[PDB]
């Protein structure tokens, strides 16, 4: 048995931040537990968390790889000549370079533990034995061989989320994003199930790397992909995915999946339609990872959705037990889990309580082309503010009339409280959107108004400068109703 | 008819500034406006045309050409992500680039053309504008004041918006050299080229010629002092030098051409002041741009010039003559299109809108489209350090993740924030690497709202991006205390 000031269950974004800050800013004794030290099967997430191993970082590399499909084709407009028939996308080379890059980060975090005093790493499955004891076991079976027992005065739960699998017959024929990262070969025909950013991002990855005669289909059970994003943007990205050869099946949901004699999958939709594919990747949701923690042993309370319930400072119902990051089922983003972990350790080991602000958080979707957003979409703004204005600009950038990708419209929309000009949200679609939106998140912390954008001098020629050129609302919401003139 | 025409405002120069002023005077305030320019569409002999330098031989076509040049990196970098193709078959077709560019520019030319037909009170006159007197602009067939008169335009107010022009140094064999204007029209990409100058135009062109050079080629950039891009962040100056070298560009600093002659094969033989020599197919001089005031006949009305040669103006763009104003590059200040545009809008609001307004020339964001590019806004540290007793510099430099796989590990991203350490106010932000021009725009908005470093640091990052580094810097890398560089406060 071993003592500590902080035991962190889960060496991911939120937990490495919390642990690192405690060991180094406040010189506490920290233990951190995870099930695996390097990425991949069988447990996928590992030292560094979801982001590093099966998340933001490898997805970004693979989206970057998929973008060359457009680049190679678009180069001809600017005079570039080569043998187009010689072009092939080697997925194994992609995956191998991606794995090497992720493994470098893994080795780097191992070195971080070996080099930082008062921060120890424990390999295996952690769970709550009592209010101040964490057990680590050989496997996730609450019953396997104990490896270590750790008493702790404070306990941080930061075990993240896991893909949700619907309970349809044949679900075990489907993969999740976890397995997608390791596919031996690029699927020829693939169905991504879901309308959110993971389904959209992988559909473009697979679309770029599919072999000759490939097809990517994305299905979603409701009418329009990317619920929660700007409505013009959802429509436009739908249109740009279609122009790049992806087939979008809206109002469709798998009812079952079966095995074909050749090893491919036979998907039957609730509507009766059928599709044969090599891979069915479910990306319908991620759920808080709470099962393995034996939370009953101490009474830590859950919300009706399955998140560990927390107050604004991340405290559970049981004193000295905390929860940050995806396990709380709030904003599922890496930097938000990091900010929670830092605010928590500031509150508990330093002294200036700090709470994470969950409004006006900027985020991105690495679709092709990508989306960058911060703050409210207009239909949510229309329910809290009596007068809302929407400034909108949309057009194909001149580089994309030369490249031949004419379908590539840039969209910039600014939503305001029309009573005092306060910017409430900014929504972007087009090359560079994720990069443009970062400093827009700072603007929103400063309560920028539309006149602060419009009075700023443009950087020319950029897409971003569009945000500084809008003076006149394209339309309004008054008391929740959409209209073109103010009444 | 054979009678002069009358206007509230005559603008000489239909470019960035003049078109903004004219359009706004006509459409917002119902003035009667004339705009004069020398050519309706781009290209020789006069290069700039309706739409200005920006549209014809500046921002717009250079960005299309830098975008074309970036495919050289994209093609190469694709291999690290598993793209395979016949490398040996790769050609850069400069003539296709130039054709595509001319066609895009000409489309813009044509759309300005129809704006004039349907805008009531906004008229275009072709030829050369000069001041005959306080209320009469004469338009002539050429820049020579003896050339024939095409029109006389009566004007209550006159706006000088004639922009700037490349400067040519008076060295022997200067006639064998070209400027950026000709560079846009060269029939063939040069095998060997010297770009003379260390400013943005020389650097951006070096990148473009480097991508499109034929098989045995070489781009050399020379600069008379010791480090390119004066006026920019010093770290970024040194790093951009390294990245350009890494891409096969030869940077010769502390070198200056003394003379140029023709070898017997027709190539250019450049001798430097050091006595070093270089043979090239093209010498592009880009040592500076000067205000275009010579053709205006300013002596006729007594408009004063600064020592530097620009039209002297007050904060409201007024000259020493009551109803004659000047904006844009002719005033030899900040030579940027959106600055000319903002000056034009402010001037018109002031004169005809009764809502006085002056352009703010501080904290203007701007970009260099070098490969890799720069985005910058506000003070560089050594300027800040002369004005503020305590200055903190936050600095981060990293290889973005993609370049761990691409092959281009030399592509370091640099992000610097310079602050007044007494109260945390951001004084300057300086960025080098892919996306920097796009990231920096909203930074301009932050600086105009007096952001502090903690406004940055408390903002949650968008992950994974390069921009998020701006919102993860909490501890100075170093300081200046009463002008003195030091890694810690005393
Ligand atoms: C495909 C995909 C793409 C994504 N892209 C982005 C993006 O672009 N930008 C963004 O901001 N966010 C992105 N995310 C979300 C981001 O990955 C998460 O929000 C983030 O990782 C949450 O961090 P966390 O600390 O809550 O959990 P995690 O980082 O998931 O860490 C949990 C850790 O706990 C370990 N663990 C679980 N149970 C136990 C146990 N009982 N004992 C010991 N260890 C355990 C796991 O092995 C894991 O390493 C993406 C997610 C996915 C799935
Ligand atoms: C190569 C290059 C690249 C550039 N890149 C950028 C960039 O990326 N971003 C940026 O912001 N700025 C850029 N600039 C600068 C930008 O082009 C100028 O700051 C801007 O055009 C200034 O606008 P203006 O209205 O002062 O003058 P202009 O746009 O130059 O307009 C002046 C007009 O007056 C006309 N004219 C001149 N004399 C007369 C006369 N006597 N009678 C009638 N008409 C006349 C000319 O034909 C011209 O059309 C670049 C410039 C160059 C040369
Ligand atoms: Cl769905
Ligand atoms: Cl819907
Ligand atoms: Cl060619
Ligand atoms: Cl020089
Ligand atoms: Na350690
Ligand atoms: Na931050």
mmCIF file of N, CA and C in Angstrom, chain A residues 349-416:
data_model
loop_
_atom_site.group_PDB
_atom_site.id
_atom_site.type_symbol
_atom_site.label_atom_id
_atom_site.label_comp_id
_atom_site.label_asym_id
_atom_site.label_seq_id
_atom_site.Cartn_x
_atom_site.Cartn_y
_atom_site.Cartn_z
ATOM 1 N N UNK A 349 -5.538 23.172 -4.127
ATOM 2 C CA UNK A 349 -4.219 23.134 -3.554
ATOM 3 C C UNK A 349 -3.575 24.506 -3.426
ATOM 4 N N UNK A 350 -4.094 25.485 -4.152
ATOM 5 C CA UNK A 350 -3.607 26.857 -4.052
ATOM 6 C C UNK A 350 -4.778 27.484 -3.377
ATOM 7 N N UNK A 351 -4.856 28.789 -3.370
ATOM 8 C CA UNK A 351 -6.125 29.302 -2.897
ATOM 9 C C UNK A 351 -6.606 30.548 -3.571
ATOM 10 N N UNK A 352 -7.446 30.275 -4.562
ATOM 11 C CA UNK A 352 -8.206 31.265 -5.264
ATOM 12 C C UNK A 352 -9.031 30.217 -5.981
ATOM 13 N N UNK A 353 -10.230 29.932 -5.437
ATOM 14 C CA UNK A 353 -11.160 29.137 -6.203
ATOM 15 C C UNK A 353 -11.358 29.722 -7.620
ATOM 16 N N UNK A 354 -11.487 28.816 -8.569
ATOM 17 C CA UNK A 354 -11.597 29.139 -9.983
ATOM 18 C C UNK A 354 -12.593 28.176 -10.585
ATOM 19 N N UNK A 355 -13.535 28.743 -11.320
ATOM 20 C CA UNK A 355 -14.419 27.932 -12.121
ATOM 21 C C UNK A 355 -14.258 28.147 -13.652
ATOM 22 N N UNK A 356 -14.355 27.034 -14.400
ATOM 23 C CA UNK A 356 -14.221 27.040 -15.851
ATOM 24 C C UNK A 356 -15.481 27.681 -16.430
ATOM 25 N N UNK A 357 -15.301 28.647 -17.314
ATOM 26 C CA UNK A 357 -16.402 29.248 -18.067
ATOM 27 C C UNK A 357 -16.689 28.385 -19.330
ATOM 28 N N UNK A 358 -17.888 27.806 -19.395
ATOM 29 C CA UNK A 358 -18.312 26.912 -20.497
ATOM 30 C C UNK A 358 -19.064 27.639 -21.593
ATOM 31 N N UNK A 359 -19.232 28.957 -21.491
ATOM 32 C CA UNK A 359 -19.790 29.748 -22.585
ATOM 33 C C UNK A 359 -18.690 30.280 -23.523
ATOM 34 N N UNK A 360 -19.099 30.598 -24.736
ATOM 35 C CA UNK A 360 -18.191 31.218 -25.703
ATOM 36 C C UNK A 360 -16.874 30.418 -25.892
ATOM 37 N N UNK A 361 -16.970 29.106 -25.898
ATOM 38 C CA UNK A 361 -15.786 28.275 -26.152
ATOM 39 C C UNK A 361 -15.702 28.074 -27.654
ATOM 40 N N UNK A 362 -14.563 28.431 -28.213
ATOM 41 C CA UNK A 362 -14.344 28.240 -29.644
ATOM 42 C C UNK A 362 -14.042 26.763 -29.939
ATOM 43 N N UNK A 363 -14.533 26.265 -31.084
ATOM 44 C CA UNK A 363 -14.275 24.893 -31.478
ATOM 45 C C UNK A 363 -14.264 24.775 -32.978
ATOM 46 N N UNK A 364 -13.801 23.609 -33.472
ATOM 47 C CA UNK A 364 -13.610 23.354 -34.903
ATOM 48 C C UNK A 364 -14.132 21.968 -35.276
ATOM 49 N N UNK A 365 -14.473 21.803 -36.568
ATOM 50 C CA UNK A 365 -14.763 20.543 -37.157
ATOM 51 C C UNK A 365 -13.826 20.448 -38.339
ATOM 52 N N UNK A 366 -13.018 19.387 -38.374
ATOM 53 C CA UNK A 366 -12.061 19.155 -39.450
ATOM 54 C C UNK A 366 -12.617 18.420 -40.584
ATOM 55 N N UNK A 367 -13.805 18.876 -40.976
ATOM 56 C CA UNK A 367 -14.352 18.513 -42.264
ATOM 57 C C UNK A 367 -13.552 19.183 -43.368
ATOM 58 N N UNK A 368 -13.814 18.718 -44.573
ATOM 59 C CA UNK A 368 -13.198 19.322 -45.675
ATOM 60 C C UNK A 368 -14.329 19.896 -46.519
ATOM 61 N N UNK A 369 -14.353 21.263 -46.670
ATOM 62 C CA UNK A 369 -13.585 22.269 -45.874
ATOM 63 C C UNK A 369 -14.020 22.337 -44.405
ATOM 64 N N UNK A 370 -13.190 22.944 -43.564
ATOM 65 C CA UNK A 370 -13.475 22.811 -42.141
ATOM 66 C C UNK A 370 -14.426 23.934 -41.622
ATOM 67 N N UNK A 371 -14.891 23.791 -40.389
ATOM 68 C CA UNK A 371 -15.792 24.742 -39.757
ATOM 69 C C UNK A 371 -15.094 25.286 -38.499
ATOM 70 N N UNK A 372 -15.266 26.560 -38.164
ATOM 71 C CA UNK A 372 -14.745 27.156 -36.909
ATOM 72 C C UNK A 372 -15.913 27.973 -36.325
ATOM 73 N N UNK A 373 -16.206 27.777 -35.045
ATOM 74 C CA UNK A 373 -17.352 28.413 -34.406
ATOM 75 C C UNK A 373 -17.008 28.821 -32.966
ATOM 76 N N UNK A 374 -17.572 29.940 -32.532
ATOM 77 C CA UNK A 374 -17.532 30.345 -31.132
ATOM 78 C C UNK A 374 -18.855 31.060 -30.754
ATOM 79 N N UNK A 375 -19.528 30.610 -29.689
ATOM 80 C CA UNK A 375 -20.702 31.325 -29.123
ATOM 81 C C UNK A 375 -22.001 30.846 -29.705
ATOM 82 N N UNK A 376 -23.035 31.698 -29.714
ATOM 83 C CA UNK A 376 -24.395 31.179 -29.937
ATOM 84 C C UNK A 376 -24.779 31.092 -31.400
ATOM 85 N N UNK A 377 -25.477 30.037 -31.765
ATOM 86 C CA UNK A 377 -26.104 30.050 -33.087
ATOM 87 C C UNK A 377 -27.385 30.862 -32.957
ATOM 88 N N UNK A 378 -27.921 31.265 -34.096
ATOM 89 C CA UNK A 378 -28.949 32.300 -34.086
ATOM 90 C C UNK A 378 -30.296 31.811 -33.514
ATOM 91 N N UNK A 379 -30.633 30.550 -33.716
ATOM 92 C CA UNK A 379 -31.886 30.046 -33.151
ATOM 93 C C UNK A 379 -31.853 29.939 -31.608
ATOM 94 N N UNK A 380 -30.690 29.697 -30.993
ATOM 95 C CA UNK A 380 -30.541 29.831 -29.521
ATOM 96 C C UNK A 380 -30.480 31.325 -29.052
ATOM 97 N N UNK A 381 -29.749 32.169 -29.781
ATOM 98 C CA UNK A 381 -29.752 33.582 -29.463
ATOM 99 C C UNK A 381 -31.219 34.093 -29.561
ATOM 100 N N UNK A 382 -31.971 33.727 -30.589
ATOM 101 C CA UNK A 382 -33.360 34.239 -30.745
ATOM 102 C C UNK A 382 -34.291 33.901 -29.537
ATOM 103 N N UNK A 383 -33.988 32.842 -28.802
ATOM 104 C CA UNK A 383 -34.767 32.539 -27.594
ATOM 105 C C UNK A 383 -34.354 33.280 -26.340
ATOM 106 N N UNK A 384 -33.140 33.828 -26.260
ATOM 107 C CA UNK A 384 -32.817 34.617 -25.083
ATOM 108 C C UNK A 384 -32.822 36.148 -25.241
ATOM 109 N N UNK A 385 -32.781 36.654 -26.464
ATOM 110 C CA UNK A 385 -32.668 38.086 -26.723
ATOM 111 C C UNK A 385 -33.860 38.461 -27.567
ATOM 112 N N UNK A 386 -34.458 39.600 -27.258
ATOM 113 C CA UNK A 386 -35.632 40.072 -27.954
ATOM 114 C C UNK A 386 -35.322 40.473 -29.387
ATOM 115 N N UNK A 387 -34.171 41.113 -29.588
ATOM 116 C CA UNK A 387 -33.741 41.502 -30.958
ATOM 117 C C UNK A 387 -32.348 40.933 -31.262
ATOM 118 N N UNK A 388 -32.245 40.171 -32.336
ATOM 119 C CA UNK A 388 -31.004 39.518 -32.718
ATOM 120 C C UNK A 388 -30.767 39.876 -34.169
ATOM 121 N N UNK A 389 -29.538 40.287 -34.509
ATOM 122 C CA UNK A 389 -29.210 40.507 -35.936
ATOM 123 C C UNK A 389 -28.234 39.459 -36.403
ATOM 124 N N UNK A 390 -28.332 39.103 -37.672
ATOM 125 C CA UNK A 390 -27.383 38.151 -38.296
ATOM 126 C C UNK A 390 -26.718 38.817 -39.498
ATOM 127 N N UNK A 391 -25.386 38.958 -39.442
ATOM 128 C CA UNK A 391 -24.625 39.486 -40.561
ATOM 129 C C UNK A 391 -24.027 38.271 -41.252
ATOM 130 N N UNK A 392 -24.187 38.207 -42.568
ATOM 131 C CA UNK A 392 -23.735 37.036 -43.296
ATOM 132 C C UNK A 392 -23.049 37.432 -44.591
ATOM 133 N N UNK A 393 -21.912 36.785 -44.827
ATOM 134 C CA UNK A 393 -21.278 36.819 -46.119
ATOM 135 C C UNK A 393 -20.922 35.393 -46.589
ATOM 136 N N UNK A 394 -21.197 35.121 -47.864
ATOM 137 C CA UNK A 394 -20.907 33.842 -48.466
ATOM 138 C C UNK A 394 -20.522 34.000 -49.959
ATOM 139 N N UNK A 395 -19.468 33.319 -50.410
ATOM 140 C CA UNK A 395 -19.033 33.444 -51.813
ATOM 141 C C UNK A 395 -17.879 32.453 -51.963
ATOM 142 N N UNK A 396 -17.684 31.974 -53.181
ATOM 143 C CA UNK A 396 -16.531 31.226 -53.557
ATOM 144 C C UNK A 396 -15.321 32.167 -53.677
ATOM 145 N N UNK A 397 -14.270 31.962 -52.873
ATOM 146 C CA UNK A 397 -13.025 32.739 -52.994
ATOM 147 C C UNK A 397 -12.426 32.600 -54.359
ATOM 148 N N UNK A 398 -11.751 33.663 -54.786
ATOM 149 C CA UNK A 398 -11.211 33.727 -56.141
ATOM 150 C C UNK A 398 -10.220 32.558 -56.409
ATOM 151 N N UNK A 399 -9.352 32.212 -55.441
ATOM 152 C CA UNK A 399 -8.479 31.018 -55.640
ATOM 153 C C UNK A 399 -9.256 29.741 -56.062
ATOM 154 N N UNK A 400 -10.504 29.598 -55.623
ATOM 155 C CA UNK A 400 -11.286 28.420 -55.974
ATOM 156 C C UNK A 400 -12.083 28.456 -57.262
ATOM 157 N N UNK A 401 -12.271 29.624 -57.871
ATOM 158 C CA UNK A 401 -12.582 29.672 -59.300
ATOM 159 C C UNK A 401 -11.357 29.307 -60.152
ATOM 160 N N UNK A 402 -10.144 29.643 -59.739
ATOM 161 C CA UNK A 402 -8.970 29.199 -60.537
ATOM 162 C C UNK A 402 -8.703 27.685 -60.372
ATOM 163 N N UNK A 403 -8.854 27.181 -59.157
ATOM 164 C CA UNK A 403 -8.530 25.765 -58.896
ATOM 165 C C UNK A 403 -9.555 24.871 -59.542
ATOM 166 N N UNK A 404 -10.739 25.375 -59.828
ATOM 167 C CA UNK A 404 -11.810 24.497 -60.316
ATOM 168 C C UNK A 404 -12.706 23.913 -59.210
ATOM 169 N N UNK A 405 -12.432 24.159 -57.929
ATOM 170 C CA UNK A 405 -13.343 23.718 -56.867
ATOM 171 C C UNK A 405 -14.390 24.803 -56.599
ATOM 172 N N UNK A 406 -15.218 25.117 -57.595
ATOM 173 C CA UNK A 406 -16.208 26.219 -57.478
ATOM 174 C C UNK A 406 -17.265 26.027 -56.395
ATOM 175 N N UNK A 407 -17.548 24.771 -56.046
ATOM 176 C CA UNK A 407 -18.451 24.515 -54.935
ATOM 177 C C UNK A 407 -17.956 25.005 -53.562
ATOM 178 N N UNK A 408 -16.677 25.386 -53.449
ATOM 179 C CA UNK A 408 -16.080 25.749 -52.139
ATOM 180 C C UNK A 408 -16.391 27.175 -51.666
ATOM 181 N N UNK A 409 -17.601 27.391 -51.178
ATOM 182 C CA UNK A 409 -17.978 28.728 -50.689
ATOM 183 C C UNK A 409 -17.412 28.887 -49.274
ATOM 184 N N UNK A 410 -16.773 30.024 -48.975
ATOM 185 C CA UNK A 410 -16.512 30.469 -47.635
ATOM 186 C C UNK A 410 -17.844 31.085 -47.028
ATOM 187 N N UNK A 411 -18.248 30.712 -45.801
ATOM 188 C CA UNK A 411 -19.398 31.336 -45.133
ATOM 189 C C UNK A 411 -18.857 31.987 -43.828
ATOM 190 N N UNK A 412 -19.164 33.283 -43.611
ATOM 191 C CA UNK A 412 -18.867 33.973 -42.324
ATOM 192 C C UNK A 412 -20.176 34.570 -41.833
ATOM 193 N N UNK A 413 -20.616 34.229 -40.598
ATOM 194 C CA UNK A 413 -21.877 34.731 -40.007
ATOM 195 C C UNK A 413 -21.571 35.240 -38.627
ATOM 196 N N UNK A 414 -22.043 36.444 -38.327
ATOM 197 C CA UNK A 414 -21.880 37.042 -37.005
ATOM 198 C C UNK A 414 -23.329 37.274 -36.469
ATOM 199 N N UNK A 415 -23.582 36.783 -35.255
ATOM 200 C CA UNK A 415 -24.882 36.872 -34.595
ATOM 201 C C UNK A 415 -24.712 37.906 -33.496
ATOM 202 N N UNK A 416 -25.629 38.872 -33.432
ATOM 203 C CA UNK A 416 -25.529 39.890 -32.366
ATOM 204 C C UNK A 416 -26.830 40.086 -31.582
#
